[PDB]
């Protein structure tokens, strides 16, 4: 995160590498999000940068609105589909992996969210909490 890190983050098992397409949850016009980068990413050789839950990323739209399409944009993950482990040891995973468009500071360009999200993202990105229906 960095800029819009309202506090810190605990590591989350990583399942969304570059090349990953993930759903878009919000009301911004999009259908999918092609990850291409990650903020705070590590720099190792022939290692793919992997996103997580809460990790802001740069993404593209391969499917959706022609105002959003053919340009990068910051985006944030809310769902992972990869079993990670909270400090209470609960191994949990969604069925899908999705995210939402944003500005660099973290405020969703979209005004709502369609489905559940992660409590980590909800605690780290307050605007997502604002536009959240359900959290976990």
């Amino acid at each position: 995160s960095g800029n819009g890190a309202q506090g810190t983050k605990f590591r989350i098992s990583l399942g969304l590498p570059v090349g990953a397409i993930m759903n878009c949850a919000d009301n911004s016009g999009a259908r999918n999000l092609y990850i291409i980068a990650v903020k705070g990413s590590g720099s190792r050789l022939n290692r793919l940068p992997a996103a997580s839950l809460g990790d802001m990323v740069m993404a593209t739209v391969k499917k959706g609105k022609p105002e959003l399409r053919k340009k990068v944009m910051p985006a944030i993950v809310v769902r992972q589909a990869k079993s990670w482990r909270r400090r209470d040891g609960v191994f949990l995973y969604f069925e899908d992996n999705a995210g939402v468009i944003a500005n660099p500071k973290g405020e969703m360009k979209g005004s709502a969210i369609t489905g559940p999200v992660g409590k980590e993202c909800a605690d780290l990105w307050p605007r997502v909490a604002s536009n959240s229906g359900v959290v976990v």
């Binding site: 506090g7 810190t8 605990f10 050789l45 022939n46 400090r87 209470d88 040891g89 605690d123």
Partner: protein, 386 residues
């Protein structure tokens, strides 16, 4: 010509040579720094790694998010019956190092420890230490003066102790034997303390206490001759590759026309001496006690031994230790515990720990029940339960 794209040294070279140890009992290289203001006491201990398990407690670091919330943590369990003190040796210092000038043993010994002296015990006269006992069998005939020699000399003293492998559930009957440094009080006091403690048990309630950070010293599990790919963390070469991909491709340049030591190479993995540190103790517990597995919050009377036992070990009917996290060494194995060398405060070594629940479920599967009472309760009776 240079490396096109940079990347770091695969592996760590301080931990070389990667070779089989000299023993199944890791040498304690270094003890703490002796001080006199404190009382005479041990600075190490011996047990046997039994296995791992999982617990629950309430974290307290003021500024986390799980501050004052529950967590769950992997712990490691050691069976630590009280060690029998027999003997002490005296180390005088030289420009060539510390050096033993005397090793004083005790009169009476156990079959286990003199078995450790022997190899083929079943065909033996069991002739050992008899003339030592006959140097005993008098007031002080040839012992008092060795002790006073150690007093006059010997800046350092190390007490010889041995374990109770017959108190363990193991099948060895051959005791383990070792030395420990004492880091308390004066030298005369150390030696007379040890003289008092000849042939005597010493226990973990005396050596350690909860929320103490320690070092675990042991030999790490053997994995045989192994390739570079698991032994070092090297990139698997690609699919199309004649003559092997679980390899290193280049092992050095033309000049120097030699294989550099730093290059990776296949060979022994495991059975390695390792000394891990900063392992907070979470519970001392007692063999001669039940409810070892029961916290103040649970209060369900139950020991630590799970249903069907520890896998490859059995029970914990002796005094035992539960420490945070992993340690070097596999099940059924010796382990050498040690006080730290440095007063690490850090708001991590001082975090006071009180427990809530302890998984006493079967590790020989995916155990749903911590207790057969609970099991029968959930299930109802059974065909076998007439």
């Amino acid at each position: 010509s240079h490396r096109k794209y940079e990347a770091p040294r695969h592996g760590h070279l301080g931990f070389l040579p990667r070779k089989r140890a000299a023993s199944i009992r890791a040498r304690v290289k270094a003890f703490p720094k002796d001080d006199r203001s404190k009382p005479v006491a041990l600075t190490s201990f011996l047990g046997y790694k039994a296995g791992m398990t999982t617990i629950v407690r309430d974290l307290d670091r003021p500024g986390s998010k799980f501050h004052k919330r529950e967590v769950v943590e992997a712990v490691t369990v050691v069976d630590t019956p009280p060690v029998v003190v027999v003997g002490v040796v005296g180390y005088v210092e030289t420009p060539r190092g510390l050096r033993s000038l005397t090793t004083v043993w005790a009169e009476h010994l156990s079959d286990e420890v003199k078995r450790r002296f022997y190899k083929n015990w079943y065909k033996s006269k069991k002739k050992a230490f008899t003339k030592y006992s006959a140097k005993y069998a008098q007031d002080g005939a040839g012992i008092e003066r060795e002790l006073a020699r150690i007093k006059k000399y010997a800046s350092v003293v190390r007490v010889l102790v041995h374990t109770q492998i017959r108190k363990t559930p193991l099948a060895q009957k051959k005791a383990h034997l070792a030395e420990i440094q004492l880091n308390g009080g004066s030298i005369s006091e150390k030696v007379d303390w040890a003289r008092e403690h000849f042939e005597k048990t010493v226990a973990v309630d005396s050596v350690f206490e909860q929320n103490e950070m320690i070092d675990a010293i042991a030999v790490t599990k053997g994995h045989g001759f192994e390739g570079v790919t698991h032994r070092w963390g090297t990139k698997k070469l690609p699919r199309k590759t004649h003559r092997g991909l679980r390899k290193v491709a280049c092992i050095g340049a033309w000049h120097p026309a030699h294989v550099m030591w730093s290059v990776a190479r296949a060979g022994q993995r495991g059975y390695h001496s390792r000394t891990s540190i900063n392992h907070k103790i979470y519970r001392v517990g007692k063999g001669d006690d039940e409810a070892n597995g029961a916290t103040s919050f649970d209060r369900t009377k139950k020991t630590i031994t799970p249903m069907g036992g520890f896998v490859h070990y059995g029970e914990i009917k002796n005094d035992f230790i539960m420490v945070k996290g992993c340690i070097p060494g596999n099940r059924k194995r010796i382990v050498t515990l040690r006080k730290s060398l440095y007063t690490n405060t850090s708001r991590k070594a001082l975090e006071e720990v009180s427990l809530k629940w302890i998984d006493t479920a079967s590790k020989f599967g995916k155990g749903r029940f911590q207790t057969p009472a609970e099991k029968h309760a959930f299930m109802g009776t059974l065909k076998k339960d007439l």
